[PDB]
Design an enzyme around this catalytic site. Structure first.
Site, PDB file in Angstrom:
ATOM      1  N   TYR A 119       1.898   3.048  -3.259  1.00 44.09           N
ATOM      2  CA  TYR A 119       0.946   3.942  -3.923  1.00 44.09           C
ATOM      3  C   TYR A 119       0.812   5.319  -3.270  1.00 44.09           C
ATOM      4  O   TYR A 119      -0.088   6.065  -3.608  1.00 44.09           O
ATOM      5  CB  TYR A 119      -0.430   3.289  -4.065  1.00 44.09           C
ATOM      6  N   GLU A 175      -4.434  -8.976  -1.582  1.00 41.96           N
ATOM      7  CA  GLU A 175      -5.091  -7.869  -2.253  1.00 41.96           C
ATOM      8  C   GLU A 175      -6.591  -8.073  -2.060  1.00 41.96           C
ATOM      9  O   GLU A 175      -7.133  -9.128  -2.388  1.00 41.96           O
ATOM     10  CB  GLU A 175      -4.730  -7.940  -3.742  1.00 41.96           C
ATOM     11  N   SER A 197       0.782  -1.224   0.000  1.00 41.60           N
ATOM     12  CA  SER A 197       0.000   0.000   0.000  1.00 41.60           C
ATOM     13  C   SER A 197       0.818   1.280   0.000  1.00 41.60           C
ATOM     14  O   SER A 197       0.450   2.248  -0.667  1.00 41.60           O
ATOM     15  CB  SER A 197      -0.947   0.016   1.193  1.00 41.60           C
TER      16      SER A 197
HETATM   17  C1  LIG Z   1      -8.503   1.211  -9.391  1.00 41.77           C
HETATM   18  C2  LIG Z   1      -7.879   2.306  -8.710  1.00 41.77           C
HETATM   19  N1  LIG Z   1      -6.729   1.773  -8.075  1.00 41.77           N
HETATM   20  C3  LIG Z   1      -5.479   2.498  -8.004  1.00 41.77           C
HETATM   21  O1  LIG Z   1      -5.349   3.627  -8.449  1.00 41.77           O
HETATM   22  C4  LIG Z   1      -4.312   1.788  -7.344  1.00 41.77           C
HETATM   23  N2  LIG Z   1      -4.647   0.735  -6.437  1.00 41.77           N
HETATM   24  C5  LIG Z   1      -4.797  -0.575  -7.081  1.00 41.77           C
HETATM   25  C6  LIG Z   1      -3.880  -1.626  -6.603  1.00 41.77           C
HETATM   26  C7  LIG Z   1      -3.832  -1.735  -5.130  1.00 41.77           C
HETATM   27  C8  LIG Z   1      -3.695  -3.072  -4.523  1.00 41.77           C
HETATM   28  C9  LIG Z   1      -3.649  -3.167  -3.117  1.00 41.77           C
HETATM   29  C10 LIG Z   1      -3.726  -2.024  -2.335  1.00 41.77           C
HETATM   30  C11 LIG Z   1      -3.855  -0.686  -2.957  1.00 41.77           C
HETATM   31  C12 LIG Z   1      -3.923  -0.609  -4.342  1.00 41.77           C
HETATM   32  C13 LIG Z   1      -4.044   0.755  -5.011  1.00 41.77           C
HETATM   33  C14 LIG Z   1      -4.582   1.871  -4.071  1.00 41.77           C
HETATM   34  N3  LIG Z   1      -3.840   1.876  -2.814  1.00 41.77           N
HETATM   35  C15 LIG Z   1      -3.968   0.538  -2.086  1.00 41.77           C
HETATM   36  O2  LIG Z   1      -3.109   0.546  -1.051  1.00 41.77           O
HETATM   37  C16 LIG Z   1      -8.901   2.818  -7.687  1.00 41.77           C
HETATM   38  O3  LIG Z   1      -9.424   2.009  -7.019  1.00 41.77           O
HETATM   39  N4  LIG Z   1      -9.247   4.240  -7.580  1.00 41.77           N
HETATM   40  C17 LIG Z   1     -10.253   4.681  -6.588  1.00 41.77           C
HETATM   41  C18 LIG Z   1     -11.144   5.780  -7.041  1.00 41.77           C
HETATM   42  C19 LIG Z   1     -11.029   5.954  -8.495  1.00 41.77           C
HETATM   43  C20 LIG Z   1     -12.123   6.885  -9.075  1.00 41.77           C
HETATM   44  C21 LIG Z   1     -11.951   7.423 -10.306  1.00 41.77           C
HETATM   45  C22 LIG Z   1     -12.943   8.264 -10.861  1.00 41.77           C
HETATM   46  C23 LIG Z   1     -14.095   8.536 -10.156  1.00 41.77           C
HETATM   47  F1  LIG Z   1     -15.003   9.301 -10.677  1.00 41.77           F
HETATM   48  C24 LIG Z   1     -14.290   7.973  -8.899  1.00 41.77           C
HETATM   49  C25 LIG Z   1     -13.314   7.159  -8.360  1.00 41.77           C
HETATM   50  C26 LIG Z   1      -9.616   6.329  -8.823  1.00 41.77           C
HETATM   51  C27 LIG Z   1      -8.650   5.272  -8.377  1.00 41.77           C
END
Ligand SMILES: C[C@H](NC(=O)CN1CCc2cccc3c2[C@@H]1CNC3=O)C(=O)N1CC=C(c2ccc(F)cc2)CC1
Length: 350
Positions: free
Chosen positions: A246, A327, A243
């Site tokens: 990121y 994860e 985590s």
């Molecule tokens: C998919 C995207 N994930 C990431 O950017 C990175 N993460 C994916 C992999 C991962 C795996 C285990 C832990 C983590 C992660 C991370 C995020 N940080 C975590 O610690 C995500 O879930 N977001 C949340 C909200 C999203 C969002 C985008 C547009 C919107 F209109 C509303 C929400 C942007 C990014």
């Protein structure tokens, strides 16, 4: 003159720091002249998302190769970049759009922050730090360094740092008990659901105005799917290290914010590879990406009905998985109750 404690004020300063917003847009190679933070509009960011969605569509399903060009053009028109003399990369593959989607994901939270920040009235009996704190709609109490919480939290940090993420060391600077306005009520139905775990969520400092004011969110339909090993969901790790990466902290800015989240995992749809289902099988409430190393089950402490997986990393059974480490993913924003926010110092290797 502010009531708030010294650590809390420092946090408020940190997440509402206009300079960090600016810096991060530069990293993303946006053109700041053609587009200042003020101009940063919610409308275009959502419009630019739709264009991203028009690409990815086409590509391997259509692909006019000149319509792709007009699309890439509508993109950099909307979001002016500044490569200088090099021209922007055409958006003609998945990996290409993932990068630009991830960036919009951040501009979104940056827009949220600056909107928040330049909004409101100045009754001005309370200094802006008090004002900006109230904009977050979250209670933030400092957790005493010498308490039991603080020691378990620090043990969680110490023990779950991964064998392969050794480009730095982590020192906890401040620990915050956090309570988002309304999140208790929201989380309320999922509290009865079993298997509830205190898990890590790392993100960049510039998302925290957004994360605190609105919670961990899920990417909407207007957005792609690339890079998402388990779909559009809210992801978590049981290893502080998975985590932390990121947070996107550098030797130049070595301090990061990370979240501890209680997540109502229920029956986990246990996976070993990226199937984008998003629609769970019945009686399954989350996905757990199985990894080669896991936190050590013999040490999974239980507090207030919630598993803290502060076992140090050992060999999980799992064979033939792509996953570094575990994860966890949920597909309903209500399955998450934020509990802590940690200010982390990243002490970089060699
Ligand atoms: C998919 C995207 N994930 C990431 O950017 C990175 N993460 C994916 C992999 C991962 C795996 C285990 C832990 C983590 C992660 C991370 C995020 N940080 C975590 O610690 C995500 O879930 N977001 C949340 C909200 C999203 C969002 C985008 C547009 C919107 F209109 C509303 C929400 C942007 C990014």
């Amino acid at each position: 003159k502010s009531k708030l404690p010294k650590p809390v004020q420092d946090l408020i300063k940190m997440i509402f720091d206009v300079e960090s917003m600016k810096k991060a847009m530069v990293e993303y190679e946006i053109d700041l002249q053609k587009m200042p933070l003020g101009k940063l509009s919610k409308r275009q960011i959502q419009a630019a998302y739709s264009i991203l969605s028009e690409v990815q569509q086409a590509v391997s399903q259509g692909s006019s190769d000149s319509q792709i060009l007009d699309l890439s053009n509508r993109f950099y028109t909307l979001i002016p970049h500044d490569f200088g003399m090099k021209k922007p990369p055409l958006l003609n593959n998945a990996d290409s759009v993932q990068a630009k989607a991830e960036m919009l994901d951040n501009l979104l939270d940056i827009e949220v922050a600056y909107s928040l920040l330049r909004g409101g009235s100045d009754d001005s009996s309370k200094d802006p730090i008090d004002v900006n704190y109230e904009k977050l709609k979250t209670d933030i109490k400092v957790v005493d360094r010498d308490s039991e919480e603080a020691e378990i939290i620090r043990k969680y940090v110490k023990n779950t740092h991964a064998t392969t993420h050794n480009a730095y060391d982590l020192e906890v600077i401040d620990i915050f008990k956090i309570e988002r306005e309304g999140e208790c009520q929201r989380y309320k139905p999922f509290k009865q659901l079993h298997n509830r775990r205190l898990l890590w969520h790392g993100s960049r400092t510039t998302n925290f105005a957004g994360i605190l004011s609105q919670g961990l969110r899920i990417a909407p339909p207007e957005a792609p799917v690339t890079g998402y090993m388990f779909g559009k969901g809210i992801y978590f790790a049981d290893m502080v290290s998975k985590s932390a990466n990121y947070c996107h902290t550098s030797q130049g800015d070595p301090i990061g914010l990370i979240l501890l989240g209680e997540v109502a995992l229920g029956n986990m749809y246990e996976l070993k590879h990226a199937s984008h289902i998003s629609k769970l099988p019945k009686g399954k409430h989350s996905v757990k990406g199985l990894g080669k190393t896991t936190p050590d089950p013999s040490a999974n402490i239980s507090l207030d009905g919630v598993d803290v997986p502060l076992g140090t990393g050992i060999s999980s059974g799992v064979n033939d998985t792509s996953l570094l480490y575990n994860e966890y993913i949920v597909y309903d924003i209500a399955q998450v109750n934020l509990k802590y926010l940690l200010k982390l110092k990243f002490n970089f290797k060699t």
